Amino acid sequence: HPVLEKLKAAHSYNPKEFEWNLKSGRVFIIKSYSEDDIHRSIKYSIWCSTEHGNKRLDSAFRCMSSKGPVYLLFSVNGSGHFCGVAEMKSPVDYGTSAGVWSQDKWKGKFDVQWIFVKDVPNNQLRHIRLENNDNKPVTNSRDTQEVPLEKAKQVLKIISSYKHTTSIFDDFAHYEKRQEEEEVVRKE
Protein backbone atom coordinates (compact mmCIF):
# COMPACT_ATOMS: atom_id res chain seq x y z
CA HIS A 1 0.00 0.00 0.00
CA PRO A 2 1.37 3.51 -0.80
CA VAL A 3 0.32 4.87 2.67
CA LEU A 4 2.28 2.00 4.27
CA GLU A 5 5.34 2.54 2.02
CA LYS A 6 5.45 6.20 3.09
CA LEU A 7 5.20 5.20 6.79
CA LYS A 8 8.03 2.60 6.47
CA ALA A 9 10.29 5.25 4.74
CA ALA A 10 9.65 7.87 7.43
CA HIS A 11 10.09 5.66 10.56
CA SER A 12 12.59 3.06 11.71
CA TYR A 13 10.15 0.34 12.68
CA ASN A 14 11.35 -2.64 14.69
CA PRO A 15 14.94 -1.35 15.22
CA LYS A 16 17.42 -4.13 15.65
CA GLU A 17 19.62 -2.05 17.97
CA PHE A 18 16.93 -0.75 20.43
CA GLU A 19 17.99 0.20 23.94
CA TRP A 20 15.81 -1.82 26.28
CA ASN A 21 18.18 -1.21 29.21
CA LEU A 22 16.69 2.13 30.21
CA LYS A 23 18.57 4.18 32.77
CA SER A 24 15.54 6.54 33.09
CA GLY A 25 11.99 6.82 31.69
CA ARG A 26 8.34 5.97 32.45
CA VAL A 27 6.49 3.05 30.82
CA PHE A 28 2.71 2.54 30.66
CA ILE A 29 0.32 -0.07 29.26
CA ILE A 30 -2.25 1.13 26.69
CA LYS A 31 -5.40 -0.82 26.06
CA SER A 32 -7.88 -0.47 23.20
CA TYR A 33 -11.19 -2.12 22.26
CA SER A 34 -10.84 -0.85 18.69
CA GLU A 35 -8.28 -2.41 16.30
CA ASP A 36 -9.09 0.40 13.83
CA ASP A 37 -7.86 2.89 16.42
CA ILE A 38 -4.39 1.20 16.46
CA HIS A 39 -4.19 1.63 12.67
CA ARG A 40 -5.10 5.33 13.02
CA SER A 41 -2.53 5.80 15.72
CA ILE A 42 0.23 4.40 13.45
CA LYS A 43 -0.98 6.37 10.43
CA TYR A 44 -1.40 9.78 12.08
CA SER A 45 1.15 9.40 14.94
CA ILE A 46 -1.37 10.18 17.67
CA TRP A 47 -3.15 8.66 20.66
CA CYS A 48 -5.93 9.58 23.08
CA SER A 49 -6.95 7.83 26.35
CA THR A 50 -9.72 8.59 28.83
CA GLU A 51 -9.62 12.00 30.57
CA HIS A 52 -8.10 10.21 33.57
CA GLY A 53 -5.50 8.46 31.45
CA ASN A 54 -4.66 11.56 29.45
CA LYS A 55 -3.88 13.43 32.72
CA ARG A 56 -1.69 10.60 33.96
CA LEU A 57 0.31 10.53 30.72
CA ASP A 58 0.48 14.37 30.47
CA SER A 59 1.93 14.50 34.03
CA ALA A 60 4.54 11.76 33.15
CA PHE A 61 5.61 13.50 29.97
CA ARG A 62 5.95 16.96 31.56
CA CYS A 63 7.77 15.48 34.58
CA MET A 64 10.38 13.69 32.46
CA SER A 65 11.49 17.10 31.07
CA SER A 66 13.02 15.43 27.96
CA LYS A 67 15.59 13.49 30.19
CA GLY A 68 14.26 10.13 29.09
CA PRO A 69 11.41 8.51 27.15
CA VAL A 70 7.75 7.89 28.01
CA TYR A 71 7.00 4.48 26.38
CA LEU A 72 3.49 3.11 25.66
CA LEU A 73 2.94 -0.69 25.32
CA PHE A 74 -0.08 -1.33 23.19
CA SER A 75 -2.53 -4.24 23.45
CA VAL A 76 -6.03 -4.77 22.08
CA ASN A 77 -8.55 -6.04 24.69
CA GLY A 78 -8.99 -9.81 24.41
CA SER A 79 -6.44 -10.26 21.62
CA GLY A 80 -3.98 -12.39 23.64
CA HIS A 81 -0.99 -10.26 22.54
CA PHE A 82 0.77 -6.95 22.53
CA CYS A 83 0.90 -5.21 19.18
CA GLY A 84 3.68 -2.73 19.59
CA VAL A 85 5.36 0.12 21.38
CA ALA A 86 5.28 3.89 20.79
CA GLU A 87 7.07 6.80 22.51
CA MET A 88 4.96 9.78 23.69
CA LYS A 89 6.19 12.92 21.87
CA SER A 90 4.17 15.86 23.03
CA PRO A 91 2.10 17.10 26.02
CA VAL A 92 -1.69 16.45 25.91
CA ASP A 93 -4.32 18.55 24.15
CA TYR A 94 -7.41 17.85 26.25
CA GLY A 95 -10.35 19.02 24.19
CA THR A 96 -9.72 18.29 20.58
CA SER A 97 -11.63 15.50 18.86
CA ALA A 98 -9.09 13.87 16.43
CA GLY A 99 -11.97 12.85 14.23
CA VAL A 100 -10.45 9.43 13.31
CA TRP A 101 -11.40 7.18 16.23
CA SER A 102 -14.23 4.57 16.08
CA GLN A 103 -16.22 6.26 18.93
CA ASP A 104 -16.95 9.97 19.74
CA LYS A 105 -16.06 9.33 23.46
CA TRP A 106 -12.30 9.79 22.91
CA LYS A 107 -11.59 13.50 23.46
CA GLY A 108 -8.11 14.97 23.28
CA LYS A 109 -4.90 14.16 21.43
CA PHE A 110 -1.14 13.82 21.86
CA ASP A 111 1.73 12.97 19.51
CA VAL A 112 3.31 9.50 19.46
CA GLN A 113 6.19 7.90 17.54
CA TRP A 114 5.72 4.21 16.85
CA ILE A 115 8.90 2.17 17.39
CA PHE A 116 7.71 -1.50 17.50
CA VAL A 117 4.95 -2.83 15.31
CA LYS A 118 4.89 -6.57 16.07
CA ASP A 119 2.62 -9.17 17.69
CA VAL A 120 4.07 -10.56 20.93
CA PRO A 121 1.95 -13.19 22.60
CA ASN A 122 0.97 -12.71 26.26
CA ASN A 123 2.61 -16.09 27.07
CA GLN A 124 6.02 -14.48 26.45
CA LEU A 125 5.31 -11.85 29.13
CA ARG A 126 2.93 -13.21 31.81
CA HIS A 127 5.83 -14.24 34.09
CA ILE A 128 6.59 -10.54 34.71
CA ARG A 129 4.50 -9.44 37.64
CA LEU A 130 3.76 -5.91 38.82
CA GLU A 131 4.34 -5.05 42.55
CA ASN A 132 2.37 -1.78 42.12
CA ASN A 133 -0.54 -3.82 40.87
CA ASP A 134 -1.06 -6.52 43.56
CA ASN A 135 1.56 -8.85 41.93
CA LYS A 136 -0.61 -9.34 38.84
CA PRO A 137 1.08 -10.25 35.55
CA VAL A 138 1.87 -7.33 33.23
CA THR A 139 -0.40 -8.95 30.67
CA ASN A 140 -3.49 -8.39 33.03
CA SER A 141 -3.20 -4.61 33.14
CA ARG A 142 -5.88 -1.94 32.61
CA ASP A 143 -5.37 1.10 30.45
CA THR A 144 -2.46 3.39 31.59
CA GLN A 145 -1.20 0.99 34.19
CA GLU A 146 2.32 2.09 35.04
CA VAL A 147 5.11 -0.52 34.72
CA PRO A 148 7.90 0.00 37.23
CA LEU A 149 11.27 0.67 35.50
CA GLU A 150 13.03 -2.66 36.42
CA LYS A 151 10.02 -4.65 35.20
CA ALA A 152 9.69 -2.42 32.12
CA LYS A 153 13.32 -3.19 31.08
CA GLN A 154 12.49 -6.95 31.11
CA VAL A 155 9.31 -6.35 29.15
CA LEU A 156 11.10 -4.18 26.55
CA LYS A 157 13.91 -6.74 26.21
CA ILE A 158 11.34 -9.43 25.34
CA ILE A 159 9.36 -7.26 22.93
CA SER A 160 12.51 -6.15 21.09
CA SER A 161 14.06 -9.63 20.76
CA TYR A 162 10.87 -11.62 19.94
CA LYS A 163 10.96 -13.12 16.45
CA HIS A 164 7.39 -12.17 15.44
CA THR A 165 5.49 -13.84 12.64
CA THR A 166 2.60 -11.32 12.42
CA SER A 167 1.82 -7.64 12.93
CA ILE A 168 -0.88 -5.11 12.20
CA PHE A 169 0.96 -4.27 8.99
CA ASP A 170 -0.19 -7.59 7.58
CA ASP A 171 -3.69 -6.06 7.50
CA PHE A 172 -2.79 -2.51 6.47
CA ALA A 173 -4.53 -2.65 3.10
CA HIS A 174 -7.68 -3.88 4.81
CA TYR A 175 -7.76 -0.95 7.22
CA GLU A 176 -7.16 1.54 4.37
CA LYS A 177 -9.92 0.08 2.16
CA ARG A 178 -12.42 0.03 5.04
CA GLN A 179 -11.53 3.60 6.07
CA GLU A 180 -12.07 4.77 2.53
CA GLU A 181 -15.33 2.86 1.91
CA GLU A 182 -16.92 3.81 5.26
CA GLU A 183 -16.17 7.50 4.55
CA VAL A 184 -18.07 7.15 1.24
CA VAL A 185 -21.08 5.69 3.08
CA ARG A 186 -21.05 8.59 5.57
CA LYS A 187 -20.94 11.17 2.73
CA GLU A 188 -23.82 9.58 0.69
Next chain:
RNA sequence: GGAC
Protein backbone atom coordinates in the same frame (compact mmCIF):
# COMPACT_ATOMS: atom_id res chain seq x y z
C1' G B 1 -22.35 -1.48 30.16
C1' G B 2 -16.42 -1.35 29.15
C1' A B 3 -10.26 1.32 26.15
C1' C B 4 -7.89 -6.07 32.49
